[PDB]
Structure formats: structure tokens, C-alpha cells
Amino acid sequence: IRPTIGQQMETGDQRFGDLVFRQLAPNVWQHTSYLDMPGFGAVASNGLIVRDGGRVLVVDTAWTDDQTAQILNWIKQEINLPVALAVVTHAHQDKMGGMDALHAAGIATYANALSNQLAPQEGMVAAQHSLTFAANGWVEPATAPNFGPLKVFYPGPGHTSDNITVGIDGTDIAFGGCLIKDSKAKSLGNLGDADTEHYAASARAFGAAFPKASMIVMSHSAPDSRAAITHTARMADKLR
Ligand SMILES: CC1(C)S[C@H]([C@H](NC(=O)COc2ccccc2)C(=O)O)N[C@H]1C(=O)O
Ligand SMILES: [Zn+2]
Ligand SMILES: [Zn+2]
């Protein structure tokens, strides 16, 4: 697997069917799935798997149901603990394309209320539960029951108006999804649904929400330093 967009395979990557898994911490793995483009090649998308004692938590689906069912099969084989819930980080196919596989498995799914409202318009199935957010971006705790180490933060509109992010408490990892691009990126990716006015502030708000996270995970590049945040914000400064 050699994607046109997204990180390549490296030492420490485990191939499992059509997907790639990489351990990031004792209890955190990155899942990677690929959508092949007629004429362009494969585009990688990354999410996370977190072990929290006797249960597993997932951030983001794969691009498709079948790929997402493979994530669940990898969890069964390598961890052998139940998936308690999944959080999906906005209403686009790379993050929510496999909702039906989670539902078929009986996994409780959560997304920003706005993501659930946009899902029908975006060709997605809504999560079964809605997260809501305070005026400073922090999730309302009663809407995120029993989330363990997942600390959900809405940084403001950027890549989309509904994009959310997730810090992993008890680790130095934070997940920026499609909002954050890596420190070497040349572009901000698909800006078709983006808020170019507010993007820079939203990227910086993510950094300030998780100020001690040193490993920044993102949808389409390998985990990076905090320069992913600062570089994304610098590129976004140019859009205003
Ligand atoms: C990696 C991206 C540039 S595309 C992805 C997202 N597209 C889809 O999920 C489904 O459409 C397609 C998906 C892939 C290729 C073509 C169509 C979007 O529109 O934002 N997020 C972008 C990003 O992270 O910048
Ligand atoms: Zn998107
Ligand atoms: Zn994306």
C-alpha cells in the first residue's frame, strides 16, 4: 500500500487486511484506511483506538463500512475487549463513512450535534448520540457520559463548521482530525466546506486546549510535533 495522499508505511506499521495499524502509546493505536480514487490513487485517513481498562474506545470510522468492520476485527484479534463507544469528528466520508458497521456491532456512536444534523446532507448516517459544546469549545460533560480519557473539544469552524478534536487524557496525544495538517504540508487540503475567516483561530484554539500534548495525530499524515498546529495556523493566516 503506497497512498498518493497520507503517510507511507514505516517500521512499526502492521498491515491487517486492507488497513494499517500503528501503536502510538501502550494504550493507543492509529488506524489507517485507504480510499482509492479513479485516476489519482489511494488516500489514507487516520483515526484512533484507545484501551481504557476493560474496554476500547474508537475515534473516527474508516472510509467505508467494510473497512470499519475490519477495524473491529483487528480490535477483536489484538485486544479482545469490547468497544464501548466511538466518537466521529465531522460529517465527511473519511470520518463517518463506516457508521453502519459500528451500529451493526452495537457500538454507541457520538458526534457533534451539528455533525448529526449535517450527516443526511453529506451522504452520512448520523451518530446515535449528540455532543454539545460550551461557548469556549469544551464538551458539555453530560453529553459525553463515561468517555474515560477522551477529552472532546470543539475548536471553532475551520476545515468544516462541525469539526471536533479529541485529547487523550493520561497521554501526550491529541487528535486534530482534518483540521490539522502536518508541519511540512503545502496546503490545507479540501477547503470546499471550510471557514477561511476563522480557521487560524480554530487551529490555535485546539493547540491551547491541549497545551501539553506533544504528539499531534491527524487525518492524513503521520503523527507529528506541535509544529503541525503552528504551521496549520500560519497557513490559515494567509486565507484572511
Ligand atoms: C483529504 C481531503 C483533501 S479529502 C477528505 C474529505 N473527503 C471525503 O471524505 C469524501 O470525498 C472524497 C474523499 C477523498 C477524495 C475525494 C473525495 C473532505 O471533503 O474534506 N478530507 C480532506 C482533508 O482532510 O483536507
Ligand atoms: Zn472533511
Ligand atoms: Zn480529511
Q: In angstroms, what is the resolution?
A: 1.4
41 bridge partner residues: 37
Ligand 3 centre to CA of 144 (Å) is 24
Fold for domain 1-240?
Metallo-beta-lactamase; Chain A (3.60.15)
96 in contact with ligand 1, CB cutoff 6 A: no
Please give the annotated binding residues for Ca(2+), written as ranges: 65, 100
Elucidated via: X-ray
Q: Residue holding cell 483515526? A: 47
- Kind and range of the H or E run holding 36: strand 28-37
**Cβ 72 vs Cβ 83: under 8 Å:** yes
90 in contact with ligand 1, CB cutoff 6 A: no
* Dist CA 108 CA 120 (whole Å): 19
Ligand 3 centre to CA of 54 (Å) is 30
* Dist CA 30 CA 179 (whole Å): 17
* Dist CA 193 CA 190 (whole Å): 8
Cα–Cα separations (whole angstroms), residue 124 to 72, 116, 131, 133, 236: 19, 9, 17, 22, 27
| Interaxial angle between packed helices 199-209 and 227-237, expressed in degrees from 0 to 180 and rounded to the nearest 10 | 160
